[PDB]
Amino acid sequence: QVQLVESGGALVQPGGSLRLSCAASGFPVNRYSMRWYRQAPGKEREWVAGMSSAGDRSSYEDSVKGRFTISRDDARNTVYLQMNSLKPEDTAVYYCNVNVGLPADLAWFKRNTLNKPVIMGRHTWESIGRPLPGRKNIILSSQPGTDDRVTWVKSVDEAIAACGDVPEIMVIGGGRVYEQFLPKAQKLYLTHIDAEVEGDTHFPDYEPDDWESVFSEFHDADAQNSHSYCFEILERRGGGMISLIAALAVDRVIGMENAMPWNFEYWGQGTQVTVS
Ligand SMILES: NC(=O)C1=CN([C@@H]2O[C@H](COP(=O)(O)OP(=O)(O)OC[C@H]3O[C@@H](n4cnc5c(N)ncnc54)[C@H](OP(=O)(O)O)[C@@H]3O)[C@@H](O)[C@H]2O)C=CC1
Ligand SMILES: COc1cc(Cc2cnc(N)nc2N)cc(OC)c1OC
Numbered sequence: 001q002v003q004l005v006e007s008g009g010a011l012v013q014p015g016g017s018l019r020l021s022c023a024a025s026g027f028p029v030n031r032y033s034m035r036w037y038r039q040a041p042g043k044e045r046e047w048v049a050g051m052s053s054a055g056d057r058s059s060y061e062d063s064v065k066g067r068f069t070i071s072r073d074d075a076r077n078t079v080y081l082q083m084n085s086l087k088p089e090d091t092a093v094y095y096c097n098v099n100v101g102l103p104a105d106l107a108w109f110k111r112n113t114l115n116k117p118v119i120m121g122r123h124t125w126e127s128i129g130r131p132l133p134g135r136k137n138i139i140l141s142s143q144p145g146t147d148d149r150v151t152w153v154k155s156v157d158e159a160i161a162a163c164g165d166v167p168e169i170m171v172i173g174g175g176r177v178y179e180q181f182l183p184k185a186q187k188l189y190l191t192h193i194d195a196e197v198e199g200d201t202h203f204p205d206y207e208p209d210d211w212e213s214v215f216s217e218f219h220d221a222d223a224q225n226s227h228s229y230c231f232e233i234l235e236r237r238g239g240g241m242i243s244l245i246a247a248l249a250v251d252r253v254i255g256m257e258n259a260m261p262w263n264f265e266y267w268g269q270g271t272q273v274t275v276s
């Protein structure tokens with residue numbers, strides 16, 4: 001039922017302007033984070049621009065910031081991309097992207113990680129597929145890095161060193177990374193999702209008795225959030241920078257086929273912009 005339909009692509013002269021539209025159906029655009037991507041042949045797709053669900057933050061890749069501006073039309077349930085000072089290298093298929101299923105968890109994750117360094121394993125980096133704005137992104141891999149926009153490290157010790165002298169480091173997944181950082185963690189930020197879903201990755205088997213809950217907030221399933229969910233912050237009974245943040249369904253399920261099973265990603269059909 002969720003549909004994203006882009007229009008507005010055209011042939012434009014260098015230095016010209018264009019406005020793209022994405023007509024959305026099946027969800028209200030002003031209540032989800034929305035992103036634009038583009039892809040030219042022989043190149044990987046790249047994130048272009050995004051706006052947070054709350055509408056209080058927008059982010060752009062360096063080559064388009066200022067030139068491009070993202071906007072959401074409430075009455076038309078449509079997302080726009082205004083594009084100025086267009087260059088031949090802007091030639092690409094442009095399309096919108098949205099995650100649906102549990103937007104409250106993604107807002108909670110953003111609120112609790114902005115302006116902190118995040119550490120993730122290579123599989124989680126591939127699943128997210130874009131640098132998280134406003135955070136230093138640190139990727140664990142035993143192999144050389146493959147993206148200049150983030151910091152690649154080859155060990156737990158290198159990952160922590162790359163965070164520098166900060167008050168808090170957020171470890172954001174996935175299962176293998178959580179297993180190694182849980183014994184160093186002083187705090188767990190957990191979203192518990194009341195969903196029975198198949199998983200191939202689980203959060204590590206921590207002992208609830210060894211943790212004290214200092215924050216607990218219950219929420220109901222609603223029109224946007226498919227299942228009841230709760231936010232919890234635990235502190236280790238009896239100091240350090242490391243915190244884990246994770247969303248757990250029933251039986252500590254966190255992933256399936258390199259995605260979160262309660263999250264559904266949708267992509268538009270694309271519209272071709274040609275600058276010649
Ligand atoms: N909150 C949630 O519910 C979350 C769920 N997930 C889910 O987790 C799943 C992925 O988790 P998982 O499959 O365990 O993969 P991870 O995301 O933990 O990444 C694993 C990779 O990280 C690298 N790595 C791990 N430890 C080290 C180390 N000490 N030194 C160097 N490199 C290291 C290796 O990369 P290499 O092979 O290149 O060496 C390894 O293959 C996905 O389904 C994702 O959706 C992810 C994040 C949050
Ligand atoms: C920002 O979008 C994503 C974020 C995360 C990590 C994550 C998401 N939610 C919570 N509570 N903790 C986390 N560590 C994981 C993701 O997919 C695995 C994401 O893409 C949907």
Ligand SMILES: [Cl-]
Nearest residue numbers: 032033053103
């Ligand atoms: Cl969202």
Ligand SMILES: [Cl-]
Nearest residue numbers: 046047129130
């Ligand atoms: Cl990207």
Ligand SMILES: [Cl-]
Nearest residue numbers: 154155156157
């Ligand atoms: Cl290590």
